[PDB]
Amino acid sequence: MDFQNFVATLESFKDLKSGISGSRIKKLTTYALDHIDIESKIISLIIDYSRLCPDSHKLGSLYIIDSIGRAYLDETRSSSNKPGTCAHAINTLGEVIQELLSDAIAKSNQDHKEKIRMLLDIWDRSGLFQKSYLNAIRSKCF
């Protein structure tokens, strides 16, 4: 699997009605874990996938970020802005996560909003993003 396969796999989410596939998300995460040397390009792509995917697929884009983000987080526990590090990838995600969350919520139906809220809670408990960032979104968008 090379970077073009990663692009193609992410792009294939357009053909899922729900925008969600556990096995495909795992495939993207395994790729992200195996190519941390190019995390900057991977993280840019999944950020931009969340920005550009259809409204009903926003939730799935946050699941992609959940899976890669927490997979990267679990590695950091075993330089904040050195390209090629899990830490930098997570900082990059965190700098855009408020934008991505508030747009996802605005475009989500009620059931997806509740699933986004629980994802917010998971991110709070797991330490993936700053609690301040997350609580801020919780107050403004819900």
């Binding site: 994802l119 998971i122 408990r125």
Partner: peptide, 11 residues
């Protein structure tokens, strides 16, 4: 083929 969320951060 849904996305399995982590129970240790849910319950």
């Amino acid at each position: 083929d849904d996305y399995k969320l982590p129970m240790e951060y849910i319950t």
